[PDB]
């Protein structure tokens, strides 16, 4: 899996897309 | 990248709205 959470690195939503797409 | 107060509530509702509950991670095992 990948990292990012709460707004620790680049608080992105496009990054949350990486989860399935 | 946004400038809001996104600390879990929204990263959860958002990741789940995009995945459709297909093989992703963040299932707090305590």
A5 touches chain B (CB under 8 A): yes
What would the two tokens of residue B11 be? 């990263």
Task: Indicate left, alpha or beta for A13 from its phi (over 0: left) and psi (-120 to 50: alpha).
Answer: alpha
User: What is the distance between the alpha carbons of residues B21 and B16, in angstroms, rounded to a whole number?
Assistant: 6
Q: Do A20 and B24 touch (CB under 8 A)?
A: yes
Asked whether A11 and B6 are in contact (CB, 8 A), the reply is yes
B20 touches chain A (CB under 8 A): yes
User: What is the distance between the alpha carbons of residues B22 and A11, in angstroms, rounded to a whole number?
Assistant: 22
How close A8 comes to chain B (CA, Å)? 9
Q: How many domains does chain B have?
A: 1
Asked whether A2 and A15 are in contact (CB, 8 A), the reply is yes
B12 touches chain A (CB under 8 A): no
User: What is the distance between the alpha carbons of residues A5 and B8, in angstroms, rounded to a whole number?
Assistant: 7
Domain carrying residue B27: 1-30
Experimental determination approach used: NMR
């Amino acid at each position: 899996g990948i990292v990012e959470q709460c707004c620790t690195s680049i608080c992105s939503l496009y990054q949350l897309e990486n989860y399935c797409n | 990248f946004v400038n809001q107060h996104l600390c879990g509530s929204h990263l959860v509702e958002a990741l789940y709205l995009v995945c459709g509950e297909r093989g992703f991670f963040y299932t707090p095992k305590t």
